[PDB]
Scaffold this active site. Sequence first.
Site, PDB file in Angstrom:
ATOM      1  N   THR A  58       0.846  -1.222   0.000  1.00 53.74           N
ATOM      2  CA  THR A  58       0.000   0.000   0.000  1.00 53.74           C
ATOM      3  C   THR A  58       0.859   1.241   0.000  1.00 53.74           C
ATOM      4  OG1 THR A  58      -1.890  -1.008   1.155  1.00 53.74           O
ATOM      5  CG2 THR A  58      -1.668   1.375   1.279  1.00 53.74           C
TER       6      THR A  58
HETATM    7  C1  LIG Z   1      -1.753  -2.090   2.177  1.00 51.62           C
HETATM    8  C2  LIG Z   1      -0.657  -2.795   2.310  1.00 51.62           C
HETATM    9  S1  LIG Z   1       0.360  -2.747   3.673  1.00 51.62           S
HETATM   10  C3  LIG Z   1       1.690  -3.884   3.328  1.00 51.62           C
HETATM   11  O1  LIG Z   1       0.957  -1.447   3.756  1.00 51.62           O
HETATM   12  O2  LIG Z   1      -0.302  -3.278   4.831  1.00 51.62           O
HETATM   13  C4  LIG Z   1      -3.131  -2.706   2.109  1.00 51.62           C
HETATM   14  C5  LIG Z   1      -4.208  -1.645   2.362  1.00 51.62           C
HETATM   15  C6  LIG Z   1      -5.548  -2.122   1.908  1.00 51.62           C
HETATM   16  C7  LIG Z   1      -5.813  -3.265   1.218  1.00 51.62           C
HETATM   17  N1  LIG Z   1      -7.150  -3.381   0.984  1.00 51.62           N
HETATM   18  C8  LIG Z   1      -7.790  -2.296   1.512  1.00 51.62           C
HETATM   19  C9  LIG Z   1      -9.141  -1.966   1.518  1.00 51.62           C
HETATM   20  C10 LIG Z   1      -9.498  -0.797   2.139  1.00 51.62           C
HETATM   21  C11 LIG Z   1      -8.553   0.029   2.739  1.00 51.62           C
HETATM   22  C12 LIG Z   1      -7.217  -0.293   2.729  1.00 51.62           C
HETATM   23  C13 LIG Z   1      -6.812  -1.477   2.107  1.00 51.62           C
HETATM   24  N2  LIG Z   1      -3.255  -3.800   3.053  1.00 51.62           N
HETATM   25  C14 LIG Z   1      -3.456  -5.056   2.662  1.00 51.62           C
HETATM   26  O3  LIG Z   1      -3.730  -5.355   1.511  1.00 51.62           O
HETATM   27  C15 LIG Z   1      -3.332  -6.139   3.724  1.00 51.62           C
HETATM   28  C16 LIG Z   1      -1.866  -6.439   4.004  1.00 51.62           C
HETATM   29  C17 LIG Z   1      -1.607  -7.379   5.176  1.00 51.62           C
HETATM   30  C18 LIG Z   1      -0.135  -7.710   5.276  1.00 51.62           C
HETATM   31  C19 LIG Z   1      -2.096  -6.777   6.476  1.00 51.62           C
HETATM   32  N3  LIG Z   1      -4.010  -7.347   3.303  1.00 51.62           N
HETATM   33  C20 LIG Z   1      -5.192  -7.693   3.812  1.00 51.62           C
HETATM   34  O4  LIG Z   1      -5.687  -7.146   4.786  1.00 51.62           O
HETATM   35  C21 LIG Z   1      -5.921  -8.835   3.126  1.00 51.62           C
HETATM   36  C22 LIG Z   1      -7.022  -8.293   2.208  1.00 51.62           C
HETATM   37  C23 LIG Z   1      -7.704  -9.377   1.444  1.00 51.62           C
HETATM   38  C24 LIG Z   1      -7.655 -10.714   1.691  1.00 51.62           C
HETATM   39  N4  LIG Z   1      -8.403 -11.394   0.775  1.00 51.62           N
HETATM   40  C25 LIG Z   1      -8.953 -10.500  -0.102  1.00 51.62           C
HETATM   41  C26 LIG Z   1      -9.776 -10.711  -1.204  1.00 51.62           C
HETATM   42  C27 LIG Z   1     -10.173  -9.601  -1.912  1.00 51.62           C
HETATM   43  C28 LIG Z   1      -9.771  -8.320  -1.548  1.00 51.62           C
HETATM   44  C29 LIG Z   1      -8.959  -8.111  -0.459  1.00 51.62           C
HETATM   45  C30 LIG Z   1      -8.532  -9.214   0.285  1.00 51.62           C
HETATM   46  N5  LIG Z   1      -6.473  -9.732   4.125  1.00 51.62           N
HETATM   47  C31 LIG Z   1      -5.678 -10.374   4.975  1.00 51.62           C
HETATM   48  O5  LIG Z   1      -4.555 -10.754   4.669  1.00 51.62           O
HETATM   49  C32 LIG Z   1      -6.224 -10.577   6.372  1.00 51.62           C
HETATM   50  N6  LIG Z   1      -6.695 -11.926   6.611  1.00 51.62           N
HETATM   51  C33 LIG Z   1      -5.883 -12.582   7.630  1.00 51.62           C
HETATM   52  C34 LIG Z   1      -6.364 -13.988   7.857  1.00 51.62           C
HETATM   53  O6  LIG Z   1      -6.312 -14.749   6.662  1.00 51.62           O
HETATM   54  C35 LIG Z   1      -7.104 -14.127   5.665  1.00 51.62           C
HETATM   55  C36 LIG Z   1      -6.640 -12.723   5.390  1.00 51.62           C
END
Ligand SMILES: */C(=C\S(C)(=O)=O)[C@H](Cc1c[nH]c2ccccc12)NC(=O)[C@H](CC(C)C)NC(=O)[C@H](Cc1c[nH]c2ccccc12)NC(=O)CN1CCOCC1
Lengths: 243, 228, 239, 237, 215, 211, 195, 236
Positions: free
Chosen positions: F1
């Site tokens: 992100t």
């Molecule tokens: C930025 C990246 S970072 C490395 O700086 O954290 C993004 C910010 C982001 C992504 N999506 C949105 C939506 C609204 C606002 C902000 C957003 N962060 C991420 O993408 C997360 C990074 C992890 C390392 C924390 N990823 C997630 O949260 C995953 C999102 C997701 C998972 N499946 C999907 C299908 C479709 C669309 C989106 C997703 N989810 C996860 O990894 C969290 N759970 C943990 C348990 O196992 C399942 C996933």
Amino acid sequence: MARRYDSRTTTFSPEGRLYQVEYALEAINNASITIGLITKDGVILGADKVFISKLIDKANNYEKIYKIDKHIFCGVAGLNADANILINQSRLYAQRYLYNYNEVQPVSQLVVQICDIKQSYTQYGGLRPYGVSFLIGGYDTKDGYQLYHTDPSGNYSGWFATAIGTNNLTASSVLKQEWKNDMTLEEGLLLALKTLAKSTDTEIPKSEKIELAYLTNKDGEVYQKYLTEKEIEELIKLYTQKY
Amino acid sequence: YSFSLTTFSPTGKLVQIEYALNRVSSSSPALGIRAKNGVIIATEKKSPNELIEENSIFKIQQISEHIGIVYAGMPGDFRVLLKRARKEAIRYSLQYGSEILVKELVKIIASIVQEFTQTGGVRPFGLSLLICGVDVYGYHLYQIDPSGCYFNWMATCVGKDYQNNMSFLEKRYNKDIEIEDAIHTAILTLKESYEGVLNEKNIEIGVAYDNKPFKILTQNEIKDYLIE
Amino acid sequence: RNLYDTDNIIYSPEGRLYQVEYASEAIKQGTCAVAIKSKDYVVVSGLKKCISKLSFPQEKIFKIDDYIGISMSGITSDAKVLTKFMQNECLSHKFLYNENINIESLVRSVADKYQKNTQKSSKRAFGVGLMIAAYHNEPCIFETRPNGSYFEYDALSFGARSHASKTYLEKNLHLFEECSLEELILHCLKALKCSLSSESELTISNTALAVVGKNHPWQEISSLQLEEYLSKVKMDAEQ
Amino acid sequence: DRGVNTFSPEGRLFQVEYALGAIKLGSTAVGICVNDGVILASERRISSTLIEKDSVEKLLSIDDHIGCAMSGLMADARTLIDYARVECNHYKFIYNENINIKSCVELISELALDFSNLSDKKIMSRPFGVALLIGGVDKNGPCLWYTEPSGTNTRFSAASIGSAQEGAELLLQENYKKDMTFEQAEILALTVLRQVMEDKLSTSNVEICAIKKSDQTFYKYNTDDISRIIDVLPSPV
Amino acid sequence: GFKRWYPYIDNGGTVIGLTGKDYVILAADTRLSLSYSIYTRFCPKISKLTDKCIIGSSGMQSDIKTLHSLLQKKIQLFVLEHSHYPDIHVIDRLLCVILYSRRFFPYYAFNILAGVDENNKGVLYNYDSVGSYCEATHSCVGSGSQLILPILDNRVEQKNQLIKNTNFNLGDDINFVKDAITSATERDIYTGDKTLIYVIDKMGINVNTLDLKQD
Amino acid sequence: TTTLAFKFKDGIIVAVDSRASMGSFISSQNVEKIIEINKNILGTMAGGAADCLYWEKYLGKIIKIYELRNNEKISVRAASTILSNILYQYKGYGLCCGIILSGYDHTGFNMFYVDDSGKKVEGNLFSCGSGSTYAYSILDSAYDYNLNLDQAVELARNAIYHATFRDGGSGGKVRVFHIHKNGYDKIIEGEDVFDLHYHYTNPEQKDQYVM
Amino acid sequence: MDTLIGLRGNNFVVLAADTYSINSIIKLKNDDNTKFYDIHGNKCLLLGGSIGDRLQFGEFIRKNVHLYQYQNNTDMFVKSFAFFTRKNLAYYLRRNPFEVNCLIAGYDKKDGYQLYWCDYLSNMDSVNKGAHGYGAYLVSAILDKYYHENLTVDEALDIFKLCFEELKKRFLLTQINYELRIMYDNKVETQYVTV
Amino acid sequence: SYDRAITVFSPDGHLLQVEHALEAVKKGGCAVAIKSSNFAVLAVEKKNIPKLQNPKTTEKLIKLDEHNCLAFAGLNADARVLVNKTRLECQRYYLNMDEPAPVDYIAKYVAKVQQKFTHRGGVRPFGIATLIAGFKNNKEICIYQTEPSGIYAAWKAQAIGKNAKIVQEFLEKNYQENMEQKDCIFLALKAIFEVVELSSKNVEVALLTEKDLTFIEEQEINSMVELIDQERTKNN
Ligand SMILES: */C(=C\S(C)(=O)=O)[C@H](Cc1c[nH]c2ccccc12)NC(=O)[C@H](CC(C)C)NC(=O)[C@H](Cc1c[nH]c2ccccc12)NC(=O)CN1CCOCC1
């Protein structure tokens, strides 16, 4: 129906008054006289002892004046058991403040806390109020020597010289016409004896019926002295010479 | 729900405490005398019938070593307060390694008694207590009233005809009496109050003297004292 | 008696609970509801209360589950509390066991809820009586009363001036068992009309009507169908 | 003598009857629901000249699409309106949509009868003694609901509350039509208020609010709109 | 000397979703498995929430079953209380609240909420077991998602193709979904047996079945 | 992100990428990382998507009720304080949130960075996410408070592009919004960074670009 | 790490802190303002640690002290303030610890100018000079050497300049931006220093 | 615990407990609050026994936080408890929002507390009416009045307590918008002495500005009282 037995103590009356508090005030005014005054050397608290019998242990037995802390003491007018409860609570409050802040509680703050207890009793619940009124004297470095009067309602007010209990009007008149802004400890003690005699309707006070105490601040320490019978008798001899 | 059953009257009195005092003043008499080197508490324990076991009724009780208690009023209230006093004494002992002080115990029990004149849904205790004891500060005789006020007495009487008993005791009490004189005066006061003729079976005595454990006199010792 | 109707935990010298009796008295002041059942169907009709000219008529019959509905008479807030209780009970049974709740057990639980409020002085009886029409292997009509009792009926009617409806039902009871759905609906409407004042008339606005049956989930009768039925009632009464 | 939950021999709750007696006073408000929206008008019984007008408002917003007129005890009314605002906000949070006016009214009634303690918890000790006129636009269009201390909610095409409720209701009954437009609704509301008001109708003694079906947004009329309607009003007869 | 018990297992599964102009498709494999064993060959993963909305989940079967039942109960209670059926957006927010309620012990379930809204447009929501994202065209959860999503990207978005195709219809999309699930069955051990395909459009919900490899 | 925001002479510029990932798998390329809390406040979210979305919705509910009760618009500082206190109450539970709240209130334009650990830093320029360092470098090398709207939008777009180019966790589309006194505009709804690469770094497209 | 420095004289108290707001490997701000908590009645709480704990504890203490002063219509003494802060930190140490170091400075008539040193374990004592952080190792000896009784405000500021130069030259984190709070002549002054 | 409904409905629809709280308020002292362009002036009646009571102890004119001030009429103990609640809420708002609590918010909170105490079982209504003067978030001066029933309203000039009607009538007659500090103080003193005995030790006056709440000096009050006395003597 347990409500038929409820007296509704914490309830207003048609005149916006609390009957239980008024009756507690009547009890206080029936109680014996307790006077207090402030001199430039300390706060003097005196009280008339109600006679019960000559079999009462009269040595080391103060029942109308109590110590709340090294710098705070109080005189009681009303119900002795209620007074004991509130005095234990005040001692706890002063020690709690010292525990919390590493400094001694101001007299005004202690008075506020105990009066808050009384007010809470008059407002919450369905229990009767406390039938006790306090003359709390003390010393602290913020406001100097202080004397406060607290009643069952939780109301309190600061005074330079006051009296509570039976026939407090005569004591108040005497203090009004005699008290002076700058008085020595001896002068204040003599005035206290005079007002006690006037309230008790007597000429020569008897040390067997007089409780005298004074709280002073000397050499950087607050010291409370509860005069014994012989010391009060010396004071009474001085008063006899004076008048 | 809990509301105060003891409330101020228009004249500023607590008639419930007055009525508890009436019960106490109708109850049987007890007295206490502080001697020069001890303190005694005596009480008049009559036998309602020949079938009761006198040794089962306990009016003079031992709260702890060097502290005894007698009552005038209601035995159930007395038993409750006696259990509470023993618990308070052992609490103080657990805290401070030494025996509770008579003044401290009296203050605690007086506060407990006060609570029942103000809390909701309860009546005040219907008895007066006489607590005698010895500690490093000397010999103590305290009275506790149903209101929760306590009095430090040189000598006192509670129960029936307590006014006449107090006058009789005052007319012949001086602070310098010994334990034997105090016991004689106690028996004399009880005999004066009692209608009829007294005997060792009608009275009970407890003594705390000369920094010795509190003792409850036996029938034989009371008979020895009554021979005079 | 003036001395024994102050609280709900005091029996009169006749062993009566006047507060509960007054809760029941609240029921007689409501609008009339009637419920009858054939071998397959339960039809529930009711009179909706219109406050004034500009007010909409109030709801009279409510759906509890797929094959459960109720009508109420008395205090609407109590009726709402009981309705929420019943709906949650049915839904939670479906969630836990993946099957319809037993109507007898549901009614027993509602009756226990009624009763638990009559045992303490800090509470009061529900001022509402419930008519419960359901299909569970068969049509069933239950009546739950403020004092904690429940009964099962073949035909039932409560509300204000419902004794005329009761008379009609007692007259025509033998016919309901073998009636068809249309005949049963007409009979229920006729009993409601019997209760109704002559000056008042049964129109689509002030009449509520619902049916629950073998393969007929609890359903309110549409406005057009209700108009047809009311026209039939008026025509055949004209004869 | 009696508890709050005591039933009268006629099957009624004494406290509810007394609260019904309470709701009978206060400033008079009227509400009219037409196809194009719902308008709530109210009189302002300005106490004196030293009162700040904005600090007193008989027409409040429960939500972006719900307006309410209140009568009875004003403190209880404000408590009820705050509860309704909180619950409508929570509904919007958990469902991402605007609550129905009927559901809002049901929640208000549930709170109003809280003192009964019929289901266990209870915090209120007595009825509210408040009457409400809740109008708004939902997916079913404009609607206007009346709530009372007894907990019963009715739906009105036109309604009134306050001290002159009877006269206002008579005028509304004899002058209201189903197919009126919004301009006619405003004229009728202000005509009823003028007829039942003690003081001469002006732009400072009356407040109006509208939720139109188009925008579905609560809108408080200001002096310009109020004066425009006042001018449009026919001469009193 | 006892080992700790882990409260999570994976029971396999794949759920694909694909939207269109006025339709939505949700396909799911029915195999239920535990490690290298098959519990059963027919465990449906798709539940019908409304006449215009369904949900398919992959993960722990007990969590999926409980969550689907809880959502159905919430929707029925909503219908009873507010006297109208929630649409897919209301259901999405409801499911989001339900899922975050257990944020610190989450449901082991990845879910696709498919439906058609009041505008008659297909809608998909993808849930990562705590939170929601609206999917423009297609979505996939479960063990075969990493195999399938590239295929659907290639066939739908065509972002890396200069010469593009735009004529998308229900039959072609259904064939695309069948091909994707078959390709996933080729290489994913937890996907196989039968697959149920739900199409939601103006005429309602229709369920067809396709056979997959049994190994 | 990659999310970034900065103040400039005409308001605030907010920009984000659109990529979501779970591990090394790109879950989506079209998520919305800018949300509107109310009419005058925008929040850019990074970290745990579910945590960010849920707690922004919670903050929106609180702000809506506050505004309804008090008939006034909440301030960015107050909203940031509410969010930071809420997040701090959950310290030690695993929340992953980095939010930049930027908005216009009675005290001009305001920008606060709030974290899941209870941080609340007022500032003029913030960047969050795994590309935050690259975005920071690009913004710092060419930032000026007197940039026009077009120049500011170009700077934000370039910073997001470089962050996506260098960071594997950022990519998809770039969105740029402009907060001004009367609300906010979406200058770039979403622009694929595929075109940005061949506009900025490899315009000729005659060979593979060598980093 | 946040370096805090405190110096108490017969006529002044000077507190100094670095003005960096740090988030991982980047400095969010070079003019951080989350370390000083000025409290009515000539009191100051200088905090060092994680920004979240710093904000929470500093605002909690400031609001509690302001509530005390409003309720009692009086100024809390500096000793009461210091020991109240220490008691709260100790209370939370065994439940949900704030990882904050404190320099509590103030002035009151009863005790004059006062400085108290408190660590994250809630070990407190009044001192004439104190420091917190990894820069304490590099500034403590300078304070010891150049401190004397009857020092003036300008001589104290010169000592602080020596400390800042040492932190710029020898400290691993080249800290160049500092904020100073000076209490003297019953007035509180803010200064910003760059080396 | 104790949860009897102390405040109930009377047959006519009234809350007799609230009426009695109003009577307790009417038995209290007199407080007047006048608003001006960017400041307020609050005067309050004093009742001290000369030469024996300490004048400073009793305080009917108190400060809640750095910008809000309060005057009250009724029961002093109830007033003290309510004021402590309000001060705690001021600091709680500051902690939760990072901004000082505005006057409208604090007045709403006080009114809500009083309503809650009329509507909770086991408690009796507060027997006090309050005047709260402060500033809003837009730095605008405002005065609010709260009653035992819990109804609040904003004012330009208001009097509470014993004989509040006479003082309110005098204010309505003699109030002007945007007065200077001295003229506003004179108006407040005249309004309060419309019902209080004319004496410089029978009144306490404070002037609230954005900077602080400043109590007027005894010599200035003496001079103003002498001017009022001269005017009265001339009129008679
Ligand atoms: C930025 C990246 S970072 C490395 O700086 O954290 C993004 C910010 C982001 C992504 N999506 C949105 C939506 C609204 C606002 C902000 C957003 N962060 C991420 O993408 C997360 C990074 C992890 C390392 C924390 N990823 C997630 O949260 C995953 C999102 C997701 C998972 N499946 C999907 C299908 C479709 C669309 C989106 C997703 N989810 C996860 O990894 C969290 N759970 C943990 C348990 O196992 C399942 C996933």
